[PDB]
Amino acid sequence: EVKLEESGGGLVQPGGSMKLSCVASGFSFTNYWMNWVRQSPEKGLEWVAEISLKSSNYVTYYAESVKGRFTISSDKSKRSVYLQMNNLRAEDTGIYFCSLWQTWFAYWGQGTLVTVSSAKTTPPSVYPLAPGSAAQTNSMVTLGCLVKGYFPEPVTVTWNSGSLSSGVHTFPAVLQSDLYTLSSSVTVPSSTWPSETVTCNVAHPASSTKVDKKIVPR
């Protein structure tokens, strides 16, 4: 079967460069155009560039936003297409995909993440979230745990070291000022808290940081 394998993504300062590689394996793709499409949380899909995989006939199209900056190229002997990125900006962050196109987009790669950011590796500040007196009367009590100012993704949140698995809700990370922030909550019976302790264990492998935060009544 066909299989596209992508590689060469990572973190890079603005103005820097990166070159990705999409390795195609299968039957003869002389009849396909290899596309690069990037996906960001802010612009969904965004077509970047494309090349015709005819060894006889090479044609390239680029998106207006990458003209003069990006260049697409292929090497048959390696069965590979490449995207050269220069003068990268923050708007170029996203999961870059390669796709074989003939009439329709017939095959896709797994994608590789390209992050354009100047921020440094920053560990999270774990703050406890506990109900107010307006929320001390419910049969079930929702405790929480704010994870603020960390970089890069991901962090992993577990409650009571995994022994508290049902009722957990980890929310999507938001980004502000080159720094991430997400929250995780756990809802337990009001008979278990504060009688029994409840603790969020956050891990940030990038900074080799683990923080345990016990939720005590306010």
Partner: protein, 213 residues
Amino acid sequence: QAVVTQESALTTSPGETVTLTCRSSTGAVTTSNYANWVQEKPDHLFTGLIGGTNNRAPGVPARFSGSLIGDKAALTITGAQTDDEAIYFCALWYSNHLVFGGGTKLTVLGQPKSSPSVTLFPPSSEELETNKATLVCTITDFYPGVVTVDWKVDGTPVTQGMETTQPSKQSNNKYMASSYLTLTARAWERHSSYSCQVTHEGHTVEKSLSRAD
């Protein structure tokens, strides 16, 4: 630059017919834009459905079809199924470049309506020591997965400092999302009443908290 627009969201039920559209700002979409349609499911899953306006790639269920409806290209799912819930991207060719649209999030009713469970958390004493204050409004177990979040401080709506996440599918395929109201420590001392109003399917749930206690 050859902007392509699609309905941001549409909702259908199993067995019904739904029609997404695709409008070009240059003018009428024509067969010569060779309109494409790409289905995206969670986990960056991608499938090419339609090419050249109405060419269905192999393996794509017969209930999918591409066509023009006036000045737009149109994807038509006839007799939808629960596994059709996904994002559907339209792409038009413009002579020397392709352009994707914003996409359309199609919901196929797979379970009954569930109202959101809202919970409001005040700033931690730890965080205030950084002269920063963040209120956290959690939202879980709502279906379909679209919510609106409005903040009031001392009865006055807030325009700035708020940020809400895009919903996320739970194991039960209900949805969860979190909103944040970011304040200065001072600003948190300067006011007494804070509200998080979550509207879902035209019904609003509110959670407030007062520092006067």
